[PDB]
Design a binder for this molecule. Structure first.
Ligand code: ANP
Ligand code: MG
Length: 330
């Protein structure tokens, strides 16, 4: 019913030793070599602390996983171990657990982040091309390793603006891509869910991350957080329908033999396609260009098979200032 456009081969050609995370045996580190300092974050199934690796006296993050659907834990570790040394991927420092409760924590590198609602409006046009390009690099890399993040959003993109460095964090929803597998559609956060998640299409792939990327980008360049602001998962598809149009939605459903649920009968009207230019304002115009609008337009497509691959999106003209800038640095 759907195979991915790129990278479908990858987990087949890499071994079972690459994707079979149930049979991973975790060599736990020493829990007592870490000291938790201060709370820096929380989560659905987690709490995150700034911490010190005592033997080196260094800053790090400790993320205490509170589920024990225990192979979901092995999955996140296996993906972090697999993606090691990948451009712009969080560094994995250790896995430890409490000897008595066997509650596990993941220890990652600390990144001095500015929260995006503060940080994003301080970006220049070049910043945005620059930090999206660095993020594309993380996404492309893991996609080329047969992994889907499935929770791309600002909250999982730590940015040290003074160091001009980017890390993609939170691989708790990351899963391996196997052709034809019916994955869970209850992934990602509401405002970044793809149309495929919202219409219960299960045979998705790495292109889900690109729709999410486009949601991020759209809120950066139009200065509208979140760009799609549905009150629930059904209203989420209505608020996307008001932009992209109901005509191209119906062609997409027919193209994939998706039967929209009956609840949408009363809530989904006929919507014309709103051009991207109607989101241009004076306050957000600094970010606007033809290259940008064109690039957003190839991210945010009902049909996931119409979206740019991360590799393709790096090739885009929008990013040429970033490419040539790095080339002249070299
Ligand atoms: N390496 C890091 N450096 C700095 N802050 C971090 C780091 N990792 C996590 N954080 C902070 O901790 C928060 C939650 O981390 P996260 O890894 O997403 O846990 P989570 O429970 O899976 N959250 P979520 O699933 O998005 O609701 C982030 O939004 C950051 O503010
Ligand atoms: Mg998570």
């Amino acid at each position: 019913r759907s195979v991915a456009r790129v990278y479908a081969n990858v987990n087949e050609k890499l071994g079972r030793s690459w994707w079979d995370y149930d049979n991973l045996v975790v060599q736990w580190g020493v829990q007592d070599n870490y000291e938790i300092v201060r709370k820096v974050g929380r989560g659905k199934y987690s709490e995150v602390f700034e911490s010190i690796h005592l033997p080196t006296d260094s800053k790090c993050i400790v993320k205490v996983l509170k589920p024990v659907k225990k192979k979901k834990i092995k999955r996140e570790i296996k993906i972090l171990q697999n993606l090691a040394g990948g451009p712009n991927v969080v560094g994995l420092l250790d896995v430890v657990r409490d000897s008595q409760s066997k509650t596990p924590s993941i220890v990652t590198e600390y990144v001095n982040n500015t929260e995006f609602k503060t940080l994003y409006p301080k970006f220049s046009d070049f910043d945005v091309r620059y930090y999206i390009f660095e993020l594309l690099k993380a996404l492309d890399f893991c996609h080329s390793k047969g992994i889907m993040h499935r929770d791309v959003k600002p909250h999982n993109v730590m940015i040290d603006h003074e160091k001009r460095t980017l890390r993609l964090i939170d691989w708790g929803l990351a899963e391996f891509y196997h052709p034809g597998t019916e994955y869970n559609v209850r992934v990602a956060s509401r405002y970044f869910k793809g149309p495929e998640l919202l219409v219960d299409f299960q045979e998705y792939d790495y292109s889900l991350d690109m729709w999410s990327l486009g949601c991020m980008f759209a809120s950066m360049i139009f200065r509208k957080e979140p760009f799609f602001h549905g009150h629930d998962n059904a209203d989420q598809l209505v608020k996307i329908a008001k932009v992209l149009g109901t005509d191209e939605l119906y062609t997409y459903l027919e193209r994939y033999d998706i039967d929209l649920d009956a609840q949408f009968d009363d809530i989904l009207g006929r919507y014309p396609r709103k051009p991207w230019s109607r989101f241009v304002s004076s306050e957000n115009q600094r970010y606007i260009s033809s290259e940008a609008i064109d690039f957003l337009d190839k991210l945010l497509r009902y049909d996931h098979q119409e979206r740019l691959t991360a590799e393709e999106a790096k090739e885009h003209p929008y990013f040429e200032p970033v490419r040539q800038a790095a080339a002249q640095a070299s």
